[PDB]
């Protein structure tokens, strides 16, 4: 038994949610610029 990794796994999870929101913030800020300055980058397919 060593039960404390629950607290530690919690810590870990919080850290990755921070990591995730960080990356979503980057993307968003990038996409603003891209949409203003070369929107065709975001076309599909090609």
């Amino acid at each position: 038994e060593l039960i404390q990794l629950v607290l530690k796994q919690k810590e870990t999870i919080s850290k990755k949610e921070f990591q995730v929101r960080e990356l979503e913030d980057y993307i968003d800020n990038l996409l603003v610029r891209v949409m203003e300055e070369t929107p065709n980058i975001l076309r599909i397919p090609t």
Binding site: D25, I27, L30, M35, P39, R43
Partner: protein
């Protein structure tokens, strides 16, 4: 083509927004649509009152929360597909707040069409035709049920909107 109409598609995660876009612009439900990261758009050229028009149709994940791309996403929109899942009331219950956002982030003559998607999933219906059609009229929306999967009413949804935006 000699005019361009900007469309947005909006609605909760997993209603089929990406799959509608993809059914329209490649008549193919390839297939298990895997959730949208940031922002993309397709095009199709249509014809209205004998005039050729490029639809330019933007897709992103169901946000809700304000974000950096939000303003410019709505910004120039001539039409908006507002989409719910026919098998999930929650997605339908949220329509009114989607319409709110839509209405203050686009121009007032922006044409908005309500899509109840996944009409193929009859067995799992969680929302009536009639009550969705009611909401549509109360709110001066165009309304169709559709299926991105079968193709059913997908073309019609985009073209019905295009007429009301004009020749």
């Amino acid at each position: 083509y000699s005019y361009i109409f900007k469309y947005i598609i909006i609605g909760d995660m997993g209603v089929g927004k990406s799959c509608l876009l993809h059914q329209f612009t490649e008549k193919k439900f390839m297939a298990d649509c895997p959730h949208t990261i940031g922002v993309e758009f397709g095009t199709r050229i249509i014809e209205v009152s004998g005039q050729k028009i490029k639809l330019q149709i933007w897709d992103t994940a169901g946000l809700e929360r304000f974000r950096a791309v939000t303003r410019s996403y709505y910004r120039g929109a001539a039409g908006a597909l507002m989409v719910y899942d026919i098998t999930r009331r929650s997605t339908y219950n949220h329509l009114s707040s989607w319409l709110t956002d839509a209405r203050n982030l686009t121009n007032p003559n922006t044409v908005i069409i309500l899509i109840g998607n996944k009409a193929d999933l009859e067995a799992q219906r969680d929302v009536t035709y009639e009550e969705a059609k009611q909401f549509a009229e109360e709110n001066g929306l165009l309304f169709l049920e559709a299926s991105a999967k079968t193709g059913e009413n997908v073309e019609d949804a985009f073209l019905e909107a295009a007429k009301k935006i004009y020749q």
